Design a protein around this nucleic acid. Structure first.
Length: 1150
RNA sequence: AUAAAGAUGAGACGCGUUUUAGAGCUAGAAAUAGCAAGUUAAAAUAAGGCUAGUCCGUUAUCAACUUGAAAAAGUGGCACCGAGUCGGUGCUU
DNA sequence: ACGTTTGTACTCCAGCG
DNA sequence: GCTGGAGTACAAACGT
DNA sequence: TCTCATCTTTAT
């Protein structure tokens, strides 16, 4: 029944906790120990920290999952092309697809001839001679008109299908135009033809170098207009140029159209927006936009095709053939020139795969930048290498075809080459003539966003709904999938539910009902006073309705002067009118009413009451959807009510935005007696004219009980689920959840007594922590107080009062920050209970500080300082590393090549790692203690053993299905199930003399002991290493410097401390001897440098993984415990989250 | 109202890696030496799973024991003197 | 006595734009 | 980056 | 690397 308090310091990787008293004294309690060990009770202190690894975002998982989906859909694409080709393929060469399938296989494992394409050596060699790359075949099948083998058509087809490029440019792309300057001259000619008053002169302009330059497109446009004599980027020529490069121009102010009329060529909406602009001004500018489109194609195609087009129909394949030819000629010239001038470095350049020469370029792993960096100094120290250097600075020397520049290739180039192939070979094989649009669709079918993963219901990420029950193919995607419903579900599954009624969706922000609510909610607070009126008056219902029907209904924005004149003096005949409660600018305006009115040109439609639901459906359609036909499909349900032009204007309009207040909140819930909803209340409340918040906070109204009935339904959520819906990074969420369970266990330990302070430090996230812990404790006034502090408030209490924190010494500092937090929070709430709103030098002055009424233990300047120093000097602090089963991916992602090892993991089931390579370095989920008998030696005796067998993440399910069979498959016989112990990572083992080790794997350990350095040495280290510079006053920091330069024996005493603690627990002999030798070597450096590097010295000592530290110039590599045989006969400790509750298992008894 | 950042989800490219294909030639008995060539493709890209889908498979949660279908629940006196990872003393239980 | 096993110290390595 | 896996070279220890 | 949606939080 002793009053207490809890201090907490929450971090991304650590949560510290402590318990304070009113005397500010960490209590010490005896706790019972379970298990089979001799020890039964441990006195432990009520201060400690929990350490864990950081919680990870789901972005990496989303990236991996999207990659898996892309590989599955690509394999489906080759599968579809194979089903198309199969019937004739069996006629010409059966099992060709089979030979391609088993291409990744050795000859011992294949079932056909090793050559994939033709099935014999001679035609394979002849094919590789005729087409050295696949682009040679692609250019041939596009250009030639003779009949070719079906295998070659399929090969080019599947290459085009598998690497089909990007979908960033929507519309059509015509590769026939590729000259930037020719279409620039055409643009100038068309502009001068239409516009004669101010013609544009652009003769003598290097259009190719400007418009295809490598810098940004905005600066490209700026460079272009700077050269232009007397033109503006906002002008017509500048706007056309910006439209050609792709930056969106505004055509409003130039044609004076009063609508934005933005045109972007990469968007499919541009055709209909161009139709809009043609309807606005006429068709005489259509040739100008056509020439702008051609000029855009000239810019966007010359950067990648870089070849003549008048001679071929596949200019990308022509570009790759040209690149191969330049590579061949330049390689021949380079080989001859190196063999002539520098014959010694021919084996390095052309034979050595380890170096970054041409052998490293081709056979090795060297990239293009690395090879250029290697070969450029070689070319400088030679003659006749001017052209090679010219192409090297242009990044066009010895270039590969499958390079990273291929990411900018549109899918239109591959589609056009594919179309050319089908048009050339349709007359010989009729099946491509009959299946032409099928293959073109297979390339150009991309599942849209707003359509979920094409599932049936066993998916957690899917929202897509089905019209039929047929399998979704590339061709019946628009017949099985309801695209409008799926897009609505896409928007709705992420949009919010309103907080008052959690099972109901929100309306769009530009809904007219929300707009009526906002306009009326602002109008009901409108105050006005007139001459002759004693007190100013809430507006009555007819007054507010008249304002809405005149000033609001005519003007988009209504000001105070408009009210005071146009209603109050014009109609109410009051001139001396003043207002309050509102500003000059009304926050709520009825924008959607005016915009929709200007769309339709009808006023009697909207002011009717029975049609408002259909207009709500139009604003829903205009907020949800951003495909044009997918808006038009929903607008076609109301096709009868308006004109064609009206709904083209409706289709053209779009509202982005969602509100937070739903519609059954407004025209829904109603009083049990009156039967009017809150909008009907807000239309005519009476003299009271109350607004929304009180109508949801009125005790007499039944709205209050309905919304609490809505909030109670569902019972909120569980602790982890309520943690999940919060904002912020998942790591801080993990820290908060550990904090909540730490508080729960701390309350449990004390005898189920709750403390009337909980002190927290880490803004809105912290207010949410205060909310959840306040709800957990007080179960509605705050019987338990929750106080949130800041890092500055304790940093000050440490810098001013010599309570410095060297974090590199030990992990006790989280617990000590928590205890301090408790100290200062309780002292502040006792000292100033008036200033609890912001939280829920008093440290001459009285020795026992007091507020003046009940300052009993506010801050006594004696005792309390001594007690806080004793607490911060306490050797025993329960540091707990949270034991975690490691999850994630199994093994490193690198596919290492073939070698004769047992540590290579197979990439499939039939892929023997010695033959096919495989992954390596698996990750253990947890280790298990196996006590069995393994056959040893050639006499195969049942030698009983006790070993740790680490279960990797890939084998966790197989182990947990049946441990006995899995251990017997490993080789352990007569296994004893009752002694199988699940040992996760960070499991603690106490071996001898207090030496504790934490499990890292089945073959490695971590140091698990903490160095409690005497606090005098800690303060001397912090002052001497100048940690956080110097915060004391010049006299005080002068005395601190004197302290530093007079207690220099502390340096050797701390070295003795590290040496003693290392020789007791951290059994690293050589590193400790190097530590002492390097201390003796640098014993003459100034005290600051020495103490800072002694602060570095604690890495040999800190709990966790051993890591390399650096003492001045000497660095020491880590001592690692690369076998776990010692903890097999040690005391295994199971620790609670606070660690006060323990269970010790003596493993040497098993 | 504007901007930035973060979180979550979906749709897409490009590259990398791996095994195989792209008959290497001459002088020798070989070791090896000299020369020629090099730019591409197929397949896989977590093993795999059943619910067999253009699905899912690397996030969050996780001391022990007991009740357990699970979720979840239950399981362990206090005070004082001190401090090298917590120890000792007394009483109740 | 001597031939396989475990410790110890050191090195490199880790899918990305 | 961290930190756990793997290979290598070499010696001490175990076991036959 | 690319495209898109939804939300929140902070600063102005």
């Amino acid at each position: 029944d002793k009053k207490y308090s809890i201090g907490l310091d929450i971090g991304t990787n650590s949560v510290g906790w402590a318990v304070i008293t009113d005397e500010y004294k960490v209590p010490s309690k005896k706790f019972k120990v379970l298990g089979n060990t001799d020890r039964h009770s441990i006195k432990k202190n009520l201060i400690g920290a929990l350490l864990f690894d950081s919680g990870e975002t789901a972005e990496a998982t989303r990236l991996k999952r999207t990659a898996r989906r892309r590989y599955t859909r690509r394999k489906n694409r080759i599968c579809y092309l194979q089903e198309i080709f199969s019937n004739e393929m069996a006629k010409v060469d059966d099992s060709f697809f089979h030979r391609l399938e088993e291409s990744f296989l050795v000859e011992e494992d294949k079932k056909h001839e090793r050559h994939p394409i033709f099935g014999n050596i001679v035609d394979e060699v002849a094919y590789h001679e005729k087409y050295p790359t696949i682009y040679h075949l692609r250019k041939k099948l596009v250009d030639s008109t003779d009949k070719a083998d079906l295998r070659l058509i399929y090969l080019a087809l599947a290459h085009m299908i598998k690497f089909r490029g990007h979908f960033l440019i929507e519309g059509d792309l015509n590769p026939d135009n590729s000259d930037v300057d020719k279409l620039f001259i055409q643009l100038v000619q068309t502009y001068n033809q239409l516009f004669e008053e101010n013609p544009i002169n652009a003769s003598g302009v290097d259009a190719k170098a400007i418009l295809s330059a490598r810098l940004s497109k905005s600066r490209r446009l700026e460079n272009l207009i700077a050269q232009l004599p007397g033109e503006k980027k906002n002008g017509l020529f500048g706007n056309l140029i910006a439209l050609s490069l792709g930056l969106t121009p505004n055509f409003k102010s130039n044609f004076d159209l009063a609508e934005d009329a933005k045109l972007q060529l990469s968007k499919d909406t541009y055709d209909d927006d161009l139709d809009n602009l043609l309807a606005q001004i006429g068709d005489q500018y259509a040739d100008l936009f056509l020439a702008a489109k051609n000029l855009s194609d000239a810019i966007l195609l010359s950067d990648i095709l870089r070849v003549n087009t008048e001679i071929t129909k596949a200019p990308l394949s022509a570009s790759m053939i040209k690149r191969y030819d330049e590579h061949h000629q330049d390689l021949t010239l380079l080989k001859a020139l190196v063999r002539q001038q520098l014959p010694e470095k021919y084996k390095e350049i052309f034979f050595d795969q380890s170096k970054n020469g041409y052998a490293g370029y081709i056979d090795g792993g060297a990239s293009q930048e690395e090879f250029y960096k290697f070969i450029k100094p070689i070319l400088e120290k030679m003659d006749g290498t001017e052209e090679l250097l010219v192409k090297l600075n242009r990044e066009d020397l010895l270039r590969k075809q499958r390079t990273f520049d291929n990411g900018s290739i549109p899918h239109q180039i591959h589609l056009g080459e594919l179309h050319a192939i089908l048009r050339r070979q349709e007359d010989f094989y009729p099946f491509l003539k009959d299946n032409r649009e099928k293959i073109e669709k297979i390339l150009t079918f991309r599942i849209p966003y707003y359509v979920g993963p094409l599932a049936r219901g066993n998916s957690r990420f899917a929202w897509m709904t089905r019209k039929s029950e047929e399998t979704i193919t590339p061709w019946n995607f628009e017949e099985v999938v309801d695209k409008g419903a799926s897009a609505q579900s896409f928007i709705e599954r992420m949009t919010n539910f309103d907080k008052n009624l959690p099972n109901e969706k929100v309306l769009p922000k530009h809904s007219l009902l929300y707009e009526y609510f906002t306009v009326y909610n602002e109008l009901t607070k409108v105050k006005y006073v007139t001459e002759g009126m004693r007190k100013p008056a809430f507006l009555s219902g007819e007054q507010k309705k008249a304002i809405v029907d005149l000033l609001f209904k005519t003007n988009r924005k209504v000001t105070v002067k408009q009210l005071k004149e146009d209603y109050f003096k014009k109609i109410e005949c009051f001139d001396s009118v003043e207002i309050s409660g509102v500003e000059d600018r009304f926050n709520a305006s009825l924008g959607t009413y005016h915009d929709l009115l200007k769309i339709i040109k009808d006023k009697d439609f909207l002011d009717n009451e029975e049609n408002e639901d259909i207009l709500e459906d139009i604003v829903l359609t205009l907020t949800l959807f951003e495909d044009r036909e997918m808006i038009e499909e929903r607008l076609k349900t109301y096709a009868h009510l308006f004109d064609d032009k009206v709904m083209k204007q409706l289709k053209r309009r779009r509202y982005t935005g969602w509100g937070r207040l739903s519609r059954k909140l407004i025209n829904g819930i109603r009083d049990k007696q009156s039967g009017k909803t809150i909008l009907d209340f807000l239309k005519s409340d009476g003299f009271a004219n109350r607004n929304f918040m009180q109508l949801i906070h009125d005790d007499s109204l039944t709205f209050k009980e309905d919304i609490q009935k809505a909030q109670v339904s569902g019972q909120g959520d569980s602790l982890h689920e309520h943690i999940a819906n919060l904002a912020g990074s998942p790591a801080i969420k993990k820290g908060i959840l550990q904090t909540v369970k730490v508080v729960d266990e701390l309350v449990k330990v004390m005898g189920r007594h709750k403390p009337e302070n909980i002190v927290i430090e880490m803004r809105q996230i912290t207010k949410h922590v205060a909310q959840i812990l306040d709800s957990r404790m007080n179960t509605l006034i705050r019987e338990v107080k929750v106080i949130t502090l800041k890092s500055k408030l304790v940093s000050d209490f440490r810098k001013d009062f010599q309570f410095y924190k060297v974090r590199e010494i030990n992990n006790y500092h989280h617990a000590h920050d928590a205890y301090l937090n408790a100290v200062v929070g309780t002292a502040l709430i006792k000292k100033y209970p008036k200033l609890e709103s912001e939280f829920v030098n008093f440290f001459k002055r009285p020795l026992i500080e007091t507020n003046g009424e009940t300052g009993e233990i506010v801050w006594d300047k004696g005792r309390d300082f001594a007690t806080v120093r004793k607490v911060l000097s306490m050797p025993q602090v329960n540091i707990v590393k949270k034991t975690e089963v490691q999850t994630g991916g199994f093994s490193k992602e690198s596919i290492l090549p073939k070698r004769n090892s047992d540590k290579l993991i197979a990439r499939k089931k039939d892929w023997d790692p010695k033959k096919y390579g495989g992954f390596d370095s698996p990750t253990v989920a947890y280790s298990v203690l196996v006590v069995a008998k393994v056959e040893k030696g050639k006499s195969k005796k049942l030698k009983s053993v006790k070993e740790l067998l680490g279960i990797t993440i890939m084998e966790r399910s197989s182990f947990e299905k049946n441990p006995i069979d899995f251990l017997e498959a490993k080789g352990y016989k007569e296994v004893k199930k009752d002694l199988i112990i699940k040992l996760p990572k960070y499991s603690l083992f106490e071996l001898e003399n207090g030496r504790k080790r934490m499990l890292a794997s089945a073959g490695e350990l971590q140091k698990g002991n903490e160095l409690a350095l005497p606090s005098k040495y800690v303060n001397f280290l912090y002052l001497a290493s100048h940690y956080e510079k110097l915060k004391g006053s010049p006299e005080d920091n002068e005395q601190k410097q004197l302290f530093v330069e007079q207690h220099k024996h502390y340096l050797d005493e701390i070295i003795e401390q590290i040496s003693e603690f290392s020789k007791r627990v951290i059994l690293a002999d050589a590193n400790l001897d190097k530590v002492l030798s390097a201390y003796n070597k640098h014993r003459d450096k100034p005290i600051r440098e020495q103490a800072e590097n002694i602060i570095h010295l604690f890495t040999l000592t800190n709990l966790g993984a051993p890591a390399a530290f650096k003492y001045f110039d000497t660095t020491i590599d880590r001592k690692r415990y690369t076998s776990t045989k010692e903890v097999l006969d040690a005391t295994l400790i199971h620790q609670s989250i606070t660690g006060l509750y323990e269970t010790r298992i003596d493993l040497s008894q098993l």
